[PDB]
């Protein structure tokens with residue numbers, strides 16, 4: 001049953017599952033920051049069980065679907081989740097991470113402090129986005145990869161992230177198959 | 184102040200702030216608290232003035248001035264976590280994306296669009312219909328031109344920005360060539 | 363005697379000394395953003411006299427020690443101070459400065475808007491970190507130095523900072539020797 005800090009600001013209609021932590025001063029389900037839609041809330045937010053949202057996190061209502069946070073996610077101070085974002089399971093957003101509209105973040109991705117993701121981007125499984133990395137609209141974000149810089153570029157594979165997941169070269173090759181066949 | 188402004192009850196608005204009609208102030212905004220200037224803090228000799236039609240969506244901070252009211256123009260849109268320092272002047276129809284940071288005395292002209300997490304050095308001027316890209320760092324020396332796109336750390340011009348007319352553009356260009 | 367805005371959210375246990383300003387909507391002493399510890403608070407936060415925290419600043423409780431803010435610091439809107447950070451005296455954090463876990467910031471350092479400091483880094487005396495600078499784990503920060511960019515690189519010596527401080531040549535040699543040993 002959700003532990004919602006009294007100072008958290010939760011819009012009518014937001015779905016918060018059991019075993020969700022919502023910390024002080026979060027703003028959840030307020031209108032999408034889309035000038036065609038604001039201040040209407042056509043959709044809301046859905047936060048799934050085991051997710052911890054520590055404080056001052058903003059997660060906007062969707063325009064075409066519920067903004068979605070998967071199981072066992074960890075969102076740290078001042079993170080910004082725009083309208084229609086879909087976050088998978090076991091995702092970490094560090095402090096002041098910024099996800100633009102319609103961004104998808106896949107299973108186990110780790111987004112470092114103050115990284116910034118262009119609207120409509122896709123961060124694939126077990127990616128590590130470095131502090132302050134700027135993911136521009138056309139960048140191809142490969143699974144299991146580390147991205148750094150302005151603009152963001154691949155510097156290697158996320159070995160650290162792979163180990164912790166405890167996942168085989170089978171379930172990894174499979175994720176590559178999903179990435180490769182995505183178009 | 185006797186108008187249809189909608190202010191979320193969690194917004195923290197200093198006494199003396201001027202809020203015009205059709206304004207939206209979202210949750211946990213902090214408006215009109217003392218300028219972050221060690222020579223003045225915690226005094227509030229000036230305040231903040233938000234003009235009609237401006238939407239400030241949540242978690243936005245706009246500090247009171249040191250030498251003038253901090254000033255937000257008509258029909259602006261300020262998104263989550265934006266920071267507006269003392270003595271900033273924003274013109275009409277400006278967009279600040281999430282976590283945009285405007286240093287002290289920054290001026291932002293008509294129609295400027297500032298992308299997520301860009302940072303503008305104190306005393307800079309962002310000219311008419313400029314596009315500042317996400318995460319761009321605008322340093323003190325950069326000479327911003329009207330209608331231009333800036334990206335990067337540090338910020339550099341990369342282009343001109345995509346229904347004003349040639350007579351209106353010439354009048355802007357005129358203001359710029361004299362300053 | 364600490365002046366604490368009614369909207370500031372202060373965890374049970376937080377130590378706030380006299381002549382401290384805590385502005386609107388600060389979150390101080392909430393659990394460390396460490397998945398091994400959260401939501402436990404094994405330690406807290408200690409803010410020392412003279413410090414001004416202007417608004418919307420987050421300072422998390424420690425995992426291995428009290429998160430510590432020294433005397434006469436100035437922390438501006440939206441600054442993020444992670445678990446186990448130790449900030450010395452007369453430090454300035456501009457708006458949206460991010461200090462990762464266990465970061466140490468020494469005497470008179472000045473961190474510019476939205477700069478980002480990797481966990482376990484050390485920012486030495488009277489350093490200037492420029493707006494948006496990304497301090498990565500391998501950067502050997504040196505006292506009195508100016509760092510800018512993504513990633514951060516040394517660009518010069520913080521003469522403005524040294525001059526303001528009024529620190530003489532004797533004091534600078536002691537800091538320089540403290541660095542040469544550690």
Ligand SMILES: CC(C)(COP(=O)(O)OP(=O)(O)OC[C@H]1O[C@@H](n2cnc3c(N)ncnc32)[C@H](O)[C@@H]1OP(=O)(O)O)[C@@H](O)C(=O)NCCC(=O)NCCS
Nearest residue numbers: 094112113130131132148149462481496498499500512513
């Ligand atoms: C991206 C990251 C994982 C890389 O760490 P690493 O693999 O140990 O990398 P290194 O520090 O050895 O640096 C490797 C190279 O990448 C660069 N680099 C590393 N992190 C960078 C970053 N965030 N931005 C830009 N460049 C970066 C280094 O400058 C170096 O460049 P070089 O090849 O010219 O020497 C790390 O720097 C990072 O950003 N982690 C996130 C920290 C964070 O968000 N902490 C919050 C915890 S809650």
Ligand SMILES: CC(C)(COP(=O)(O)OP(=O)(O)OC[C@H]1O[C@@H](n2cnc3c(N)ncnc32)[C@H](O)[C@@H]1OP(=O)(O)O)[C@@H](O)C(=O)NCCC(=O)NCCS
Nearest residue numbers: 100134136137138150151280298299314316317318334335
């Ligand atoms: C600045 C911006 C408008 C440029 O758009 P664009 O011209 O379509 O840019 P593209 O991604 O097609 O590529 C332009 C070039 O500049 C680079 N670039 C674009 N935006 C950049 C940014 N923010 N930082 C760094 N480099 C950037 C690209 O890498 C590319 O470099 P290259 O051509 O040398 O390979 C856009 O990228 C941007 O930053 N928009 C902000 C997004 C935002 O804030 N959304 C929130 C909505 S509320």
Ligand SMILES: CC(C)(COP(=O)(O)OP(=O)(O)OC[C@H]1O[C@@H](n2cnc3c(N)ncnc32)[C@H](O)[C@@H]1OP(=O)(O)O)[C@@H](O)C(=O)NCCC(=O)NCCS
Nearest residue numbers: 286320322323324336337456474475490491492493510511
């Ligand atoms: C870092 C800083 C102190 C350097 O200022 P400065 O010494 O006057 O430097 P200049 O503006 O003369 O620029 C020198 C070089 O550094 C670069 N530079 C300066 N600041 C930079 C920054 N923040 N990021 C990247 N590059 C930067 C310039 O591009 C220039 O490069 P070039 O030699 O290739 O042309 C300043 O730019 C800064 O970032 N200050 C922090 C601002 C702030 O947070 N204010 C809030 C007030 S509370």
Ligand SMILES: CC(=O)N[C@H]1[C@@H](OP(=O)(O)OP(=O)(O)OC[C@H]2O[C@@H](n3ccc(=O)[nH]c3=O)[C@H](O)[C@@H]2O)O[C@H](C(=O)O)[C@@H](O)[C@@H]1N
Nearest residue numbers: 219220221222268286287288305306323472490520522523
């Ligand atoms: C906390 C506080 O008082 N802040 C105010 C104050 O900032 P400021 O201390 O940076 O002084 P400035 O004279 O602008 O610095 C000039 C240059 O030197 C750089 N600078 C500064 C300090 C330092 O130690 N090192 C350094 O390199 C600096 O980065 C810059 O590039 O003055 C700003 C201003 O009037 O525009 C206000 O917007 C601020 N609210």
Ligand SMILES: CC(=O)N[C@H]1[C@@H](OP(=O)(O)OP(=O)(O)OC[C@H]2O[C@@H](n3ccc(=O)[nH]c3=O)[C@H](O)[C@@H]2O)O[C@H](C(=O)O)[C@@H](O)[C@@H]1N
Nearest residue numbers: 074092110128158160161395396397398462463464481482
């Ligand atoms: C969410 C959480 O628990 N956070 C805490 C935790 O961080 P952390 O999970 O990043 O582990 P670390 O041992 O610092 O990673 C080492 C390096 O690998 C990088 N790293 C990390 C994960 C990944 O998948 N890939 C990767 O490259 C990583 O970016 C870094 O460059 O531990 C930190 C700490 O002990 O000081 C705390 O400050 C944090 N608040």
Ligand code: NA
Nearest residue numbers: 007025193211
């Ligand atoms: Na609040």
